[PDB]
Design a protein around this nucleic acid. Structure first.
Ligand SMILES: C[NH+](C)c1cc(NC(=O)CNC(C)(C)C)c(O)c2c1C[C@H]1C[C@H]3[C@H]([NH+](C)C)C(O)=C(C(N)=O)C(=O)[C@@]3(O)C(O)=C1C2=O
Ligand SMILES: C[NH+](C)c1cc(NC(=O)CNC(C)(C)C)c(O)c2c1C[C@H]1C[C@H]3[C@H]([NH+](C)C)C(O)=C(C(N)=O)C(=O)[C@@]3(O)C(O)=C1C2=O
Ligand SMILES: C[NH+](C)c1cc(NC(=O)CNC(C)(C)C)c(O)c2c1C[C@H]1C[C@H]3[C@H]([NH+](C)C)C(O)=C(C(N)=O)C(=O)[C@@]3(O)C(O)=C1C2=O
Ligand SMILES: [Mg+2]
Ligand SMILES: [Mg+2]
Ligand SMILES: [Mg+2]
Ligand SMILES: [Mg+2]
Ligand SMILES: [Mg+2]
Ligand SMILES: [Mg+2]
Ligand SMILES: [Mg+2]
Ligand SMILES: [Mg+2]
Ligand SMILES: [Mg+2]
Ligand SMILES: [Mg+2]
Lengths: 115, 76, 176, 137, 43, 51
RNA sequence: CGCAACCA
RNA sequence: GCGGG
RNA sequence: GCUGGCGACCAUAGCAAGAGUGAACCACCUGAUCCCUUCCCGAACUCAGAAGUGAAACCUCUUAGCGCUGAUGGUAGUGUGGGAUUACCCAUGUGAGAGUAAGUCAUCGCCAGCU
RNA sequence: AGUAACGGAGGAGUACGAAGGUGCGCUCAGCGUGGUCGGAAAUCACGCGUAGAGUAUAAAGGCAAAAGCGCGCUUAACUGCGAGACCCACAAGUCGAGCAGGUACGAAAGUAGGUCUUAGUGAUCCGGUGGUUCUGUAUGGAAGGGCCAUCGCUCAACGGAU
């Protein structure tokens, strides 16, 4: 509650700026057990692509560490290129950019996503 | 003799372009002290909180968000 | 050091039985202990200004922080943003160590020590003690001591009622 | 005579007294009331005089509810000054009276003694008044 | 914890005057010799 | 009050900026990096007396 | 503190 | 701008 | 049928009061060696995890008590023409605020996972 | 929109190299309950918390992506400009996306041409200082002038008569 409430307060600024820029957004979410990435439209309503640690290719392994995040980043980069999404803005969603989030973002940069 | 004779010059504030009117880029829409109107799409804000059109289109006023803000936007 | 594993191994079932707490998670635990030392005489000298911080860093293993002033109370002769306090927050592996080193090596070391004041719960399981001098501390020595001030201590626990707080403080062997 | 303990501003525009009194028009504190059917101003001196003549008459039995309070300051120029040089000085305070306004209410007194008291008070006021009773809707 | 900011706190054995030798991690830098204890008081 | 001062380019060009400064809360000579347009480059401008 | 110089 | 304090 | 994320919409959606959820998910959680943190503190942030618990929290249900919405009618005001001058009246057009009856314990979309 | 009176109320003739930029973080004021002096009102802890705090400064309009409060690094308090507007007797004033160069911060999308905004000001003439392949009274120089930058007015009766 208090944690999620404060983190969403931290995310609002970047989210409103991304909406004002009118850009495709790579929104990420991180829980102690899993990680998620969604490539979302500029209008904020349509999910153009997605990836997570629930994919029958990462779930059977272990999730919630930096290696699983790198794998998710590679997978979301591929799926986003498949749907014709190249230029994105990274939405860390109130999480610090360092760590698992950074691993996902680096895997996505190397996968072909431009940001 | 009293101590009241002062006032300042007029500032000519207010809505300059109303809803439905066509604008070009750079046209001033609102002269305001604070933000009684907030910039929506294709509308920028100047240092003195002036709302101006950053694109051609028609002006549209709305009430949006959970703070019930008045928004100006330009439809292209 | 001792108190942590003691509560982890002995006091847990004891508290659960004595208080009748069904869920394991909702059992009274100690969350933090904060030692504040208000010193209003700050703009007057430096002995009693950094002496509180040094006495804390001696007593508490962790360094202190300088609590500033939030407003400008005229009758108090303070202005917004001026150092008027000091504090330290012991959380874990040091909070239990402070509880030990104050409840079994310095608890009964003050002159004419009655039991305690056991009606200070703040409507919840959070207790607040008091002290008149640092002489009781087995760390600060009365030779090096100077400009005797006193410290306030507040133990914050994950307790709901004052009864649960009383139980959690008794299991730790309080002065009652 | 009544007066605000303090105000935000010393002097006030003249204004227009127009319309009917739809708010303070119902007997709400007592059993009988005097009600203004005409429009005007009520100085604080008039309020004091009418309260005195009512209270001396009903002889302290029952309570009197004053429902008007003078909160408008009225200025006047000193004698033998010309028309400029700022606004005149405050002299007295008035309450604006719209037709239908309850001025005084009496609780705990029979109807005839209270009507005598209200007739005595009416001769101290600058507008026409009426005697009204409490109803139920 | 920040390292080069805090004080030093090491082990410490406590010799009570009533046979209740204790052990604690404190900042006395020596061996404590207690007179009063949580067993040798009027609590 | 605040005194007027020049910030002269340390690039040889005669370019300068003008600003004000509080002589009591800032007695040392101000040094700040600014764009010289005669060499089209950021250099250091040092304080000098207004002329 | 005084004497003397004053033509945006 | 020249001396005094 | 359930969770998660991102939106639309900004109280007919809220407060207050009850009640339920652990396959999964989510939360609390265990520890901090390492990356990162603390004007002190692994509280927060961060990392490595999976022994527990749905206690708290979230979420989902139920309830008009309060909020919120809200007619109809009347009233106030008012444009034009006319009549009076203490601010009204008449003809015609317009028409609140308050209050009343009543309604509300949301509706909708994209994606993923679990049954 | 504008709108007068010797109508009713108040402010200004500044401040700031950070109180500017940027990235990151934070959220008050008031209540209750406890706690060493310490007490209605200092600092600590816990519960609420209706915007009632704060904003360099008067008031108004704003302020959660806070425009309020901190920390790190910094100089965009840049140069050349500028579509298009607002306001305007003129002279002035105001806002400005975008473009080029050189930057700062940021992983990055980006954000920065001073400060929440609206007061903090003074034309022209005469002259001073820096720069300048503009000019240079036969010619070459120079003096002097021009141009760009900037300095000197309670010219406050503030469009300033000497
Ligand atoms: C539509 N209303 C009922 C609403 C809904 C939500 N919820 C969400 O959107 C997210 N959670 C849901 C969708 C409800 C499950 C809301 O989260 C909110 C609000 C209301 C606003 C009102 C805010 C308001 N001001 C700041 C514009 C205000 O003055 C108050 C107040 N108590 O005075 C508020 O509480 C307000 O700030 C506020 O917190 C709101 C919400 O958070
Ligand atoms: C500061 N913001 C985050 C905020 C938070 C809360 N609520 C809380 O803090 C919640 N309280 C907890 C700590 C959860 C118990 C708030 O409750 C509010 C507000 C904002 C204010 C804004 C107000 C504003 N004006 C008057 C300054 C305003 O004009 C509006 C508006 N919609 O136009 C408001 O809503 C405002 O008046 C208002 O009500 C606020 C809040 O209530
Ligand atoms: C509907 N709005 C206008 C509202 C009104 C009030 N009422 C008052 O404060 C009344 N106070 C008076 C007496 C009028 C001065 C309200 O008291 C509230 C709220 C908003 C709610 C929203 C709550 C919300 N839900 C989903 C739990 C929520 O999640 C948030 C949030 N994410 O910020 C809230 O702020 C919320 O919990 C909350 O506090 C609300 C109100 O308190
Ligand atoms: Mg922020
Ligand atoms: Mg508002
Ligand atoms: Mg009607
Ligand atoms: Mg209505
Ligand atoms: Mg509100
Ligand atoms: Mg002249
Ligand atoms: Mg020549
Ligand atoms: Mg020249
Ligand atoms: Mg003149
Ligand atoms: Mg003039």
């Amino acid at each position: 509650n208090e944690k999620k409430q404060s983190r969403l307060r931290r995310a609002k600024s970047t989210r409103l700026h991304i909406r004002a820029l009118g850009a495709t957004r790579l929104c990420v979410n991180r829980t102690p057990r899993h990680i998620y990435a969604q490539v979302i439209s500029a209008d904020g309503g349509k999910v153009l692509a997605q990836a997570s640690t629930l994919d029958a290719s990462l779930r059977s392994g272990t999730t919630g560490n930096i290696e699983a995040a790198t794998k998710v980043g590679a997978l979301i980069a591929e799926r986003a290129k498949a749907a014709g999404v190249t230029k994105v803005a990274f939405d860390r969603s109130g999480f610090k950019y360092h760590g698992r989030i950074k691993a996902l973002a680096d895997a996505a940069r190397e996968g072909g996503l431009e940001f | 003799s009293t101590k009241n004779g002062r006032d300042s010059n007029p500032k000519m504030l207010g809505v300059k372009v109303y809803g439905g009117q066509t604008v070009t880029a750079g046209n001033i829409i609102v002269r305001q002290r604070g933000t009684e109107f907030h910039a929506g799409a294709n509308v920028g804000m100047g240092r003195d909180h002036t709302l101006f059109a950053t694109a051609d289109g028609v002006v549209k006023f709305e009430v949006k968000g959970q703070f019930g803000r008045r928004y100006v936007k330009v439809e292209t | 050091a001792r108190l942590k594993a003691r509560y982890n191994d002995e006091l847990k079932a004891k508290l659960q039985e004595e208080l009748s707490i069904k869920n394991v998670m909702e059992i009274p635990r100690i969350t933090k202990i904060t030692l504040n030392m208000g010193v209003g005489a700050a703009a007057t000298d430096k002995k009693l200004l950094d002496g509180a911080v040094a006495d804390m860093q001696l007593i508490a293993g962790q360094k202190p922080v300088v609590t500033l002033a939030r407003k400008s109370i005229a009758g108090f002769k303070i202005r917004d943003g001026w150092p008027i306090g000091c504090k330290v927050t012991l959380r874990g592996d040091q909070m239990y160590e402070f509880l030990d080193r104050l409840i079994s090596i310095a608890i009964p070391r003050i002159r004419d020590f009655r039991g305690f004041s056991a009606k200070s719960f703040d409507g919840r399981g959070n207790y607040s003690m008091g002290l008149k001098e640092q002489i009781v501390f087995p760390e600060i020595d009365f030779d090096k001591i100077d400009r005797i001030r006193g410290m306030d201590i507040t133990i914050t626990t994950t307790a709901r009622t004052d009864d649960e707080g009383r139980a959690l403080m008794r299991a730790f062997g309080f002065p009652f | 005579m009544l007066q605000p303990k303090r105000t935000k501003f010393r002097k006030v525009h003249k204004g227009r007294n127009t319309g009917l009194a739809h708010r303070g028009s119902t007997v709400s504190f007592g059993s009988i009331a005097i009600k203004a059917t005409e429009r005007g101003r009520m100085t604080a001196r008039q309020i004091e005089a009418a309260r005195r003549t009512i209270s001396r008459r009903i002889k302290r039995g029952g309570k009197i509810f004053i429902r008007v309070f003078p909160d408008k300051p009225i200025t006047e120029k000193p004698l033998e000054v010309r028309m400029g040089n700022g606004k005149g000085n405050v002299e007295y305070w008035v309450c604006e009276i719209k037709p239908g306004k309850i001025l005084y209410e009496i609780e705990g007194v029979n109807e005839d003694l209270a009507r005598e008291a209200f007739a005595l008070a009416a001769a101290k006021l600058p507008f026409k008044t009426t005697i009204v009773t409490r109803t139920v809707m | 914890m920040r390292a080069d900011i805090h004080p030093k706190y090491e082990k410490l054995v406590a010799t009570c005057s009533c046979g209740n030798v204790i052990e604690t991690r404190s900042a006395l830098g020596k061996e404590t010799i207690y007179l009063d204890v949580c067993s040798a008081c009027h609590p | 009050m605040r005194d007027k001062i020049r910030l002269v380019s340390s690039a040889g060009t005669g370019y300068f900026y003008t600003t004000t400064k509080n002589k009591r809360t800032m007695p040392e000579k101000m040094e700040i990096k600014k764009f010289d347009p005669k060499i089209r480059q950021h250099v250091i401008f040092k304080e000098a007396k207004i002329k």
